[PDB]
Amino acid sequence: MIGLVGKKVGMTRIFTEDGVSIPVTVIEVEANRVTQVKDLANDGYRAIQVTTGAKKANRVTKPEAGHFAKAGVEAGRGLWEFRLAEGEEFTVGQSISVELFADVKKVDVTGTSKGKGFAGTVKRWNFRTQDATHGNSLSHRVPGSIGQNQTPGKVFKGKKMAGQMGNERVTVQSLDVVRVDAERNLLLVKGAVPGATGSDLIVKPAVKA
Amino acid sequence: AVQQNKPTRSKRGMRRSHDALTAVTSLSVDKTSGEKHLRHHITADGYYRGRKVIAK
Amino acid sequence: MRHRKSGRQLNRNSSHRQAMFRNMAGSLVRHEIIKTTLPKAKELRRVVEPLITLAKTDSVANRRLAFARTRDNEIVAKLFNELGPRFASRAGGYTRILKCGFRAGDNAPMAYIELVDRSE
Amino acid sequence: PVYIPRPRPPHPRL
Amino acid sequence: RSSGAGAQHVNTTDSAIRITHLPTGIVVECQDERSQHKNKAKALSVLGARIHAAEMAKRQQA
Amino acid sequence: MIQEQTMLNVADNSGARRVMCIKVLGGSHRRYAGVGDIIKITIKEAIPRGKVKKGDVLKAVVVRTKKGVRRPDGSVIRFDGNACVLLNNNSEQPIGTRIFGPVTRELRSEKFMKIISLAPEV
Amino acid sequence: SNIIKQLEQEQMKQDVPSFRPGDTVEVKVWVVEGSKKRLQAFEGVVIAIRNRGLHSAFTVRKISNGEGVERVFQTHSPVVDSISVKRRGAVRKAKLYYLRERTGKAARIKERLN
RNA sequence: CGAUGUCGGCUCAUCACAUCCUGGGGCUGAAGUAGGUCCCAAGGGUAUGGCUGUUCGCCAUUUAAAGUGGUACGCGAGCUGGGUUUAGAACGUCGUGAGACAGUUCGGUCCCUAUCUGCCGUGGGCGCUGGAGAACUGAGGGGGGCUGCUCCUAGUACGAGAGGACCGGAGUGGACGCAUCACUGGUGUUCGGGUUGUCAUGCCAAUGGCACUGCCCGGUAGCUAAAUGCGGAAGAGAUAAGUGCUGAAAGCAUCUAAGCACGAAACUUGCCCCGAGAUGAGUUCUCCCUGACCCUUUAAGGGUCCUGAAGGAACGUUGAAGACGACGACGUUGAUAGGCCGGGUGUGUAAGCGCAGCGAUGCGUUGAGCUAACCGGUACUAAUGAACCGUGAGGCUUAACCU
RNA sequence: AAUUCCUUGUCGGGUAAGUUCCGACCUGCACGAAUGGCGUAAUGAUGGCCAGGCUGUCUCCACCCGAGACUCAGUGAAAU
RNA sequence: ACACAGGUGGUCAGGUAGAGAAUACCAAGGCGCUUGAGAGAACUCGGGUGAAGGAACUAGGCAAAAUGGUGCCGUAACUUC
RNA sequence: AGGACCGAACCGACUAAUGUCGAAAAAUUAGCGGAUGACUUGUGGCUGGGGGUGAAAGGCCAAUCAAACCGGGAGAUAGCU
């Protein structure tokens, strides 16, 4: 089925009765109401695009205000889109709560990774740092050789070098569900998820069933 | 470090194409005096938001 | 990558940085308005406001903690007697920043940092 | 220049 | 490749030959001259001499 | 955390005093051992009345670590010294008849029964 | 946040005995030996307390037979059952990591008796 | 020969299969396991120490394996200089001698601030044509694809006994990569405390400056792993080796000549990421622009007044975003940054006062005081009213639709 | 052996494992008694090896403090 | 060759602590060394710390780390005593 | 008394790093060896080019040494570029 958009608010741990304390992440889930239902008659694929949160009525633009008045729902932050799985059909404006997570056992969380910035080769691609003594001059944390010789004459595309680390769209898969709370509107997941406290998280059902 | 051959006037111009400085062109008008000043900056006489904030 | 860190380095070690923050906070208490670069004023907002916060309540030990900073008797004498009963009603935010062009020596962002005063 | 120095001690290759 | 000294040829050319005779366990190491063949002939002569000596020693012990 | 060239004290009274871990057995390219993993040791110091002499290369099992072992509740058990029990290289069956110092609960699995049977604590 | 604090305050137990670091604290902890559920004892000297609310823990250093055994314990975990202070130690330092190198006569500390 | 720095080592790898293992099979002098040989298959992995400068080799112990080669028998404008080839000196040999020795050994300065291609990232202009805000489909490209041990099947088949299956399922491991501080740690020169030598505040007390943060002890938040989860797949299509069905040429036989059904970590998917600059420039939703004139080479022409629309840009507050750009939140209709209150955490009974002691010092007020980067609030201060860019509904041809 | 090609000649010790080292075996290519031999207390920024402590050398790097590297204002090269 | 981290002989030379002209802080006296302001990326230098091992790294304990002062006890082989 | 020991001034450069179109055509940083004698240094002289000098490297002789620099034979010579 479809996934839901949530906010990461810290991490905690759940003490089970037998003794095992499991580290959990508190993903709060707001009213993921449906903004538009795309069909095959106009796009060639069936999907639903939704939103979450709540914007103030000074930041939302008139194109976004008209797109939200097309659905009639309250203006919320961001827009996401989930493909349908041919077994269900959603209407425009349906308040989808966390009750869809009550039946599933494992989920997949996709989030914007925490930006590490312009990182080196050792931090990014886990290269071995060379020996810091026995005559080492100006060659401590450099990657060293990046190509062979005259006969290739170039560096191969896909070379593991220093550069941008973080701000990616990484996905930690196969995360166990712990507790689905409807009164507090929470979603406790097992393990760690990408992103810091306050980032958006796409929590979809596990494709590796 | 050492070059093979010198670049052109065209290469120098296409390099200095992004060296063009940008002017602000957003000089404001004070409420009381009306003197020209920048955004979030006081005037030459010390006027800011109409109030004499420098007292000097 | 300084995620959730505060404290500007200002291209100086901690001894010189603390010493010039001491001297500049003393000058701002003594003269009530000074003119300096903008990040020094931004960090001096984190220095002068705890001094006034300590100067909210006059006692025996508060004079010694206000003498532990600024290293001067005239600065703590102007504290607790003149700034104390005059900033009594306002709670926090006693300072004010005024951006004033750029310096002609090195093109640095200039700023008058002052208190909410000079109605004498 | 007045003085032009002795060049760099080169690679052996002997 | 060979150990010792002498020239560039020691770096790139091999000039060192080790021959092991499997059912007897006799190892012959030659690092004498420059070309391999002139060392292959010496290594085969030393193989023949050591095998003949090890067989005649067993015959004289028997 | 027991890796190569690590000096360990002998837990039982088999005879050795100081041993040196030469390889963490089980799985290639492995850094260090765990709770009750098998390591290969050499003997650096032994008593005159020991059943093994100085220089015997044999298998052992780590029982106490300075890095600490982690119970699944969230706690850690750190010991003030590394310790091992010597094993006879094809069937484990430890040499010493008395074992000093406590052990960890995760060592109890189907083959180290004599060690936890001779354990005075835990 | 209020969400994290509300999720933590519903799980913290309200009968935690207050003890300063340095007290001779005896802790009885559950353990599952397969088909058995045994309450075992552990008596030692507290050398560190890390208060984190629900995530709070405390060390109990014990000099057992042979060498010392250091073992942390989570305060609000269900695996522990009882915390009883036997002696009230009178150290003036929060952490007691310097007691690790000291064995025997130099390991004991002062009693409060205030 | 008006200069191509080579051996070995460290880091970084790329490619071929004449395949070391994993995988699918045929023969066997294959009862089972363990084997010998051979075909297809390069998707992944392919040691740790002593010696030697050594590649290599031997030894010790693992592993499923310790593959062969190419890339200037890779890689010094990435790094040493141990060895080989500068200048010193010696041992042995030759030469009357100066000197010589691929016969060692002792020791001996290895430069360069990146113009071009390439690679890792990140931006500006313009285009897609009326513009803008978003949401995606998706061409194509990239990342990964390793497997041990134990148990059930099952001591089952097989086997006189010893030994011991194939296939399938589950759990726990090692490496790799990703994610995060929930636990444990490290750092935490912005927090607290102890102490030495000196100086200063007119002196005691107290505090501050210097001596590597003076020496240390811890330690908030962030970063980080040694800490904790995750994954290599399941499934589908087309196949290589190989096993086949029907079946003539050639009354038989035949996997192939017509056809059909199987068949691998190899290929494409399926797992994840980038991505319409894919100039072939895609699709959907929404917002906004409906004012007159003269000149005329009546051209998809230029110029004048009025309006600036949606939106963007500039400035400031700034960020678990960031070299700079860029991205995200906010700008008084406010919780974006700083300050303040309370809580939490950390250091640990501040100063003053009172008591005991000749004194150092000890106790009570007090588990106080101080709290950085944390949390929940609070406009107390700073984000001003405005100015700038972007416009009068949008070209030609053809067909279907309403007039 | 500063000597030695064959050679990592052979034995023992040190290490789990030692072409280095030590004590010898003499089969001295090609040691040798003033171009001196054998030992030798003390000494050496001397060559090699081993033992204890000690540690980021390494396993395996992680964080922090200042000086550069990044941006802005002023002056402003060079090899080629 | 420079308003250059180099070199240049002799005299005076204090307080505290210190065996001392060493070293730490000061008096008399001279200076802040003729580019500053931001941000706190990869990488480079001088450093500090670090769980567990303690040389497994490397040609090589190279570099770093560690010992270090006064009084007292005691100090082996060998020797030219 | 010691061509004695540790260790400042002073003398020299053994290791590693910074530099290596450097602060400088040999330097600096952190460790070093001697430091009452075969020590160091100032001042003023003497020894000089097929020579001087050398606790001996074929080193040094004005940043140039298996035969210094300056001027002249000399526009030497060059089957060589």
Side-chain angles (χ1 to χ4, degrees):
Chain A
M1 61 185 73
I2 62 168
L4 276 75
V5 178
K7 186 186 285 184
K8 183 179 179 181
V9 181
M11 292 178 72
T12 53
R13 60 181 177 177
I14 297 299
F15 290 100
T16 63
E17 189 177 3
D18 56 356
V20 176
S21 179
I22 49 174
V24 295
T25 305
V26 182
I27 298 170
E28 64 179 1
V29 174
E30 291 86 3
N32 289 317
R33 76 279 306 277
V34 177
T35 64
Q36 188 178 2
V37 179
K38 293 181 181 179
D39 198 76
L40 279 78
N42 297 114
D43 290 330
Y45 63 96
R46 54 182 293 165
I48 50 168
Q49 61 180 357
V50 300
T51 188
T52 187
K55 289 183 181 292
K56 293 185 263 75
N58 54 5
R59 180 64 65 192
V60 55
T61 62
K62 299 291 180 67
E64 292 180 354
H67 182 74
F68 288 158
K70 181 70 175 178
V73 299
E74 188 179 2
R77 61 178 179 87
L79 288 173
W80 292 267
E81 183 173 358
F82 298 98
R83 296 290 299 274
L84 295 175
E86 192 68 27
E88 69 270 14
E89 181 68 27
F90 293 100
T91 186
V92 176
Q94 183 178 2
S95 179
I96 297 169
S97 179
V98 77
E99 292 291 328
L100 276 73
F101 290 104
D103 187 74
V104 297
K105 290 174 70 175
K106 293 172 72 175
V107 296
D108 295 334
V109 177
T110 301
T112 300
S113 67
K114 292 172 72 176
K116 304 292 177 67
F118 189 76
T121 64
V122 178
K123 188 176 186 292
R124 184 175 179 179
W125 294 103
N126 291 318
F127 287 168
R128 292 189 295 270
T129 299
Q130 296 178 358
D131 187 72
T133 182
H134 294 284
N136 194 1
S137 297
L138 299 175
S139 178
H140 295 285
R141 294 178 65 88
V142 298
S145 179
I146 60 170
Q148 289 83 17
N149 210 357
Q150 177 184 358
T151 304
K154 66 181 181 180
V155 177
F156 290 159
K157 187 182 286 185
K159 182 67 173 66
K160 299 179 179 67
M161 295 177 72
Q164 183 61 258
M165 185 178 177
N167 201 357
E168 202 174 1
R169 200 184 178 183
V170 296
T171 298
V172 174
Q173 296 178 358
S174 296
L175 295 176
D176 293 331
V177 68
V178 175
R179 184 178 292 171
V180 180
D181 196 359
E183 290 86 3
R184 294 179 182 177
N185 290 318
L186 296 176
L187 183 62
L188 295 174
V189 299
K190 185 177 179 180
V193 299
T197 299
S199 66
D200 294 331
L201 293 176
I202 292 96
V203 179
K204 64 179 73 175
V207 70
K208 293 183 179 180
Chain B
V2 177
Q3 67 183 358
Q4 184 68 41
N5 51 5
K6 63 181 287 185
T8 67
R9 279 85 65 193
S10 181
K11 181 67 183 296
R12 177 180 57 84
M14 292 183 288
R15 186 177 66 246
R16 294 178 183 177
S17 65
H18 293 283
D19 290 331
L21 293 176
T22 178
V24 49
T25 67
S26 295
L27 279 76
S28 296
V29 176
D30 191 75
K31 185 177 180 180
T32 299
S33 296
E35 293 180 353
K36 298 291 180 68
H37 63 88
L38 294 174
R39 298 294 296 163
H40 297 89
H41 293 87
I42 67 169
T43 62
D45 291 331
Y47 291 97
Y48 185 76
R49 295 179 67 188
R51 185 180 293 171
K52 183 64 67 68
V53 294
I54 191 65
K56 186 176 180 180
Chain C
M1 60 189 73
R2 51 100 61 215
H3 291 174
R4 291 290 182 266
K5 292 186 184 290
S6 296
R8 292 178 177 90
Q9 183 177 1
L10 296 177
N11 288 316
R12 289 177 181 90
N13 51 4
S14 179
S15 179
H16 187 195
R17 191 177 67 247
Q18 185 179 2
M20 69 170 291
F21 286 166
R22 178 177 293 169
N23 292 320
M24 185 171 69
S27 296
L28 182 56
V29 171
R30 187 176 65 247
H31 292 171
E32 293 179 354
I33 181 165
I34 52 172
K35 179 178 182 290
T36 186
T37 67
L38 185 64
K40 294 182 183 69
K42 288 179 182 292
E43 193 68 28
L44 189 65
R45 291 184 293 170
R46 297 181 69 249
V47 175
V48 177
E49 297 288 324
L51 292 173
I52 303 168
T53 305
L54 185 64
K56 294 293 288 184
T57 299
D58 183 74
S59 68
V60 177
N62 293 116
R63 294 294 297 268
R64 291 182 180 180
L65 272 72
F67 181 73
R69 291 180 179 90
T70 66
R71 293 297 298 161
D72 191 75
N73 287 317
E74 186 179 2
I75 303 301
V76 71
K78 190 174 181 179
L79 290 173
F80 292 92
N81 290 318
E82 293 180 353
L83 298 176
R86 189 172 66 189
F87 292 106
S89 66
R90 188 176 298 115
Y94 303 106
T95 187
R96 186 177 292 172
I97 307 296
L98 297 171
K99 295 180 177 67
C100 53
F102 291 96
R103 191 184 297 277
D106 55 357
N107 194 3
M110 291 295 106
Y112 292 106
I113 176 166
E114 71 270 14
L115 295 176
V116 184
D117 279 325
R118 297 179 70 187
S119 177
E120 295 292 328
Chain D
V2 176
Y3 180 75
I4 298 170
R6 183 178 183 271
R8 187 260 188 192
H11 303 158
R13 294 288 290 163
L14 298 176
Chain E
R1 298 180 185 179
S2 66
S3 66
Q8 292 195 58
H9 292 279
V10 183
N11 292 318
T12 61
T13 64
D14 292 330
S15 69
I17 296 164
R18 181 190 309 174
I19 301 171
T20 67
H21 190 272
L22 291 174
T24 61
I26 297 169
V27 180
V28 172
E29 298 181 354
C30 291
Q31 296 179 357
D32 291 331
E33 292 181 354
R34 293 182 179 183
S35 66
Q36 287 184 356
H37 311 268
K38 299 296 183 181
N39 290 318
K40 284 183 180 182
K42 292 182 181 180
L44 290 174
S45 67
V46 172
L47 281 166
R50 285 181 179 175
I51 289 167
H52 182 74
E55 289 179 353
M56 289 300 291
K58 290 182 181 179
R59 289 178 180 176
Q60 289 179 355
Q61 287 180 354
Chain F
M1 184 178 288
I2 300 299
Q3 63 182 357
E4 295 180 354
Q5 297 297 109
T6 300
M7 295 296 172
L8 283 80
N9 291 319
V10 180
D12 56 352
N13 53 4
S14 65
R17 182 65 60 86
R18 299 287 185 182
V19 296
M20 184 177 72
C21 181
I22 64 172
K23 184 173 286 293
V24 178
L25 294 175
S28 66
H29 203 279
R30 187 176 180 179
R31 273 72 167 173
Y32 59 93
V35 178
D37 292 331
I38 301 299
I39 61 170
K40 192 71 173 174
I41 56 97
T42 185
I43 296 171
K44 298 296 289 184
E45 184 178 1
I47 67 170
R49 296 292 185 269
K51 295 181 177 67
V52 295
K53 68 181 178 67
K54 182 175 74 175
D56 292 331
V57 179
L58 53 91
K59 293 180 181 179
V61 53
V62 180
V63 294
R64 290 189 295 273
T65 60
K66 289 176 94 288
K67 181 70 175 177
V69 293
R70 293 179 64 88
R71 296 291 299 274
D73 57 354
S75 297
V76 68
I77 301 168
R78 292 179 292 174
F79 296 102
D80 293 330
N82 294 319
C84 68
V85 177
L86 304 182
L87 298 174
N88 289 316
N89 288 315
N90 54 6
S91 294
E92 311 301 323
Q93 299 296 319
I95 302 169
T97 60
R98 296 295 181 186
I99 299 171
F100 297 99
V103 296
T104 314
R105 296 289 183 185
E106 284 84 3
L107 187 64
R108 187 192 294 266
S109 65
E110 190 66 31
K111 60 179 72 172
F112 302 111
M113 188 70 76
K114 188 70 174 177
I115 297 170
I116 52 94
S117 297
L118 293 172
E121 184 179 1
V122 177
Chain G
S1 296
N2 290 318
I3 293 95
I4 302 168
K5 183 68 176 177
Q6 186 177 2
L7 191 146
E8 287 181 353
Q9 71 183 358
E10 66 182 0
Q11 193 171 4
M12 291 171 71
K13 61 179 73 175
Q14 298 296 320
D15 53 356
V16 176
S18 66
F19 63 97
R20 292 179 66 188
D23 296 335
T24 305
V25 173
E26 192 272 331
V27 182
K28 292 182 181 180
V29 181
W30 294 102
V31 70
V32 177
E33 293 179 353
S35 179
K36 297 295 289 183
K37 186 176 175 67
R38 182 174 173 85
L39 182 61
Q40 65 183 357
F42 192 77
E43 184 177 1
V45 177
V46 172
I47 54 96
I49 293 170
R50 184 178 176 88
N51 290 318
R52 293 292 180 267
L54 180 63
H55 303 284
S56 65
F58 60 94
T59 64
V60 175
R61 184 175 176 87
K62 181 178 179 180
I63 302 169
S64 69
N65 44 3
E67 66 186 6
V69 175
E70 184 178 1
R71 182 177 178 179
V72 306
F73 294 102
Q74 300 294 322
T75 301
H76 297 284
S77 180
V79 65
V80 299
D81 186 74
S82 70
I83 296 168
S84 66
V85 176
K86 298 294 188 291
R87 295 179 66 249
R88 296 176 69 188
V91 294
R92 62 181 293 166
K93 190 178 290 294
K95 302 296 187 291
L96 298 177
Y97 290 162
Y98 60 93
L99 192 144
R100 294 179 181 177
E101 293 179 354
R102 288 181 173 89
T103 59
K105 298 293 285 184
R108 67 184 185 272
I109 58 172
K110 186 67 181 294
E111 185 67 27
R112 294 179 68 187
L113 53 87
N114 52 5

Short mmCIF file of all heavy atoms in Angstrom, two decimals, chain G residues 1-15:
data_model
loop_
_atom_site.label_atom_id
_atom_site.label_comp_id
_atom_site.label_asym_id
_atom_site.label_seq_id
_atom_site.Cartn_x
_atom_site.Cartn_y
_atom_site.Cartn_z
N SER G 1 11.44 18.29 23.64
CA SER G 1 10.07 18.38 23.15
C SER G 1 9.09 17.80 24.17
O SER G 1 9.49 17.06 25.07
CB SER G 1 9.93 17.64 21.82
OG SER G 1 10.72 18.25 20.82
N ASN G 2 7.81 18.15 24.02
CA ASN G 2 6.80 17.63 24.93
C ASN G 2 6.44 16.19 24.60
O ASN G 2 6.02 15.43 25.48
CB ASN G 2 5.56 18.52 24.90
CG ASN G 2 5.79 19.87 25.53
OD1 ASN G 2 6.42 19.98 26.58
ND2 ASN G 2 5.28 20.92 24.89
N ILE G 3 6.62 15.79 23.34
CA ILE G 3 6.32 14.44 22.88
C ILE G 3 7.29 13.45 23.51
O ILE G 3 6.89 12.42 24.07
CB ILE G 3 6.35 14.34 21.34
CG1 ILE G 3 5.21 15.15 20.70
CG2 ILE G 3 6.30 12.89 20.88
CD1 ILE G 3 5.57 16.56 20.26
N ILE G 4 8.59 13.78 23.45
CA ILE G 4 9.63 12.91 23.98
C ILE G 4 9.54 12.83 25.50
O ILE G 4 9.67 11.76 26.10
CB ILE G 4 11.02 13.40 23.53
CG1 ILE G 4 11.09 13.45 22.00
CG2 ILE G 4 12.12 12.49 24.05
CD1 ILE G 4 12.30 14.19 21.48
N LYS G 5 9.26 13.97 26.14
CA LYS G 5 9.12 14.01 27.60
C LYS G 5 7.88 13.25 28.06
O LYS G 5 7.91 12.59 29.10
CB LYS G 5 9.07 15.47 28.07
CG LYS G 5 9.00 15.64 29.58
CD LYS G 5 10.29 15.20 30.25
CE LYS G 5 10.26 15.46 31.75
NZ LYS G 5 11.48 14.97 32.43
N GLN G 6 6.80 13.32 27.28
CA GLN G 6 5.58 12.59 27.63
C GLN G 6 5.76 11.09 27.41
O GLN G 6 5.22 10.27 28.16
CB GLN G 6 4.40 13.12 26.82
CG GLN G 6 3.05 12.54 27.20
CD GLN G 6 1.91 13.15 26.41
OE1 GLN G 6 2.12 13.99 25.53
NE2 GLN G 6 0.68 12.73 26.70
N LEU G 7 6.54 10.71 26.39
CA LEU G 7 6.81 9.30 26.15
C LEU G 7 7.77 8.74 27.19
O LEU G 7 7.74 7.54 27.49
CB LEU G 7 7.34 9.11 24.73
CG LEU G 7 7.48 7.72 24.09
CD1 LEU G 7 7.19 7.82 22.60
CD2 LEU G 7 8.87 7.13 24.30
N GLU G 8 8.64 9.59 27.75
CA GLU G 8 9.57 9.11 28.77
C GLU G 8 8.94 9.08 30.16
O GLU G 8 9.25 8.18 30.95
CB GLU G 8 10.83 9.98 28.78
CG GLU G 8 11.77 9.75 27.60
CD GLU G 8 13.02 10.60 27.67
OE1 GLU G 8 13.10 11.48 28.56
OE2 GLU G 8 13.92 10.40 26.84
N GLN G 9 8.08 10.05 30.49
CA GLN G 9 7.56 10.14 31.85
C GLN G 9 6.51 9.08 32.16
O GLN G 9 6.25 8.82 33.34
CB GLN G 9 6.98 11.54 32.11
CG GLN G 9 5.67 11.83 31.39
CD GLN G 9 5.18 13.24 31.64
OE1 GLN G 9 5.79 14.01 32.38
NE2 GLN G 9 4.06 13.60 31.01
N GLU G 10 5.91 8.46 31.14
CA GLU G 10 4.95 7.39 31.38
C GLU G 10 5.63 6.06 31.64
O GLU G 10 4.96 5.11 32.07
CB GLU G 10 4.00 7.26 30.19
CG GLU G 10 4.69 6.80 28.91
CD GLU G 10 3.73 6.71 27.74
OE1 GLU G 10 2.53 7.01 27.93
OE2 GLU G 10 4.18 6.35 26.63
N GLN G 11 6.93 5.96 31.40
CA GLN G 11 7.66 4.71 31.53
C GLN G 11 8.61 4.70 32.72
O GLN G 11 8.92 3.62 33.24
CB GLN G 11 8.43 4.44 30.23
CG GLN G 11 8.98 3.04 30.07
CD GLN G 11 9.53 2.80 28.68
OE1 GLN G 11 9.56 3.72 27.85
NE2 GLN G 11 9.94 1.58 28.41
N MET G 12 9.03 5.87 33.18
CA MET G 12 9.89 5.98 34.36
C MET G 12 9.15 5.53 35.61
O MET G 12 7.99 5.90 35.82
CB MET G 12 10.39 7.41 34.53
CG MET G 12 11.37 7.90 33.47
SD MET G 12 11.69 9.67 33.60
CE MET G 12 12.65 9.78 35.11
N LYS G 13 9.82 4.74 36.45
CA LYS G 13 9.24 4.31 37.71
C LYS G 13 9.37 5.41 38.76
O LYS G 13 10.35 6.17 38.77
CB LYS G 13 9.89 3.01 38.19
CG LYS G 13 11.39 3.10 38.45
CD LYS G 13 11.95 1.77 38.94
CE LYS G 13 12.02 0.75 37.81
NZ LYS G 13 12.68 -0.52 38.23
N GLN G 14 8.38 5.50 39.63
CA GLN G 14 8.29 6.59 40.60
C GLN G 14 8.81 6.21 41.99
O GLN G 14 8.56 6.95 42.94
CB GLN G 14 6.84 7.07 40.71
CG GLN G 14 6.29 7.64 39.42
CD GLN G 14 7.03 8.89 38.98
OE1 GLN G 14 7.38 9.74 39.80
NE2 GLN G 14 7.27 9.00 37.68
N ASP G 15 9.52 5.09 42.12
CA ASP G 15 10.03 4.63 43.41
C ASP G 15 11.54 4.39 43.32
O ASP G 15 12.06 3.36 43.76
CB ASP G 15 9.27 3.39 43.87
CG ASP G 15 9.25 2.28 42.83
OD1 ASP G 15 9.76 2.48 41.71
OD2 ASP G 15 8.69 1.20 43.14
#
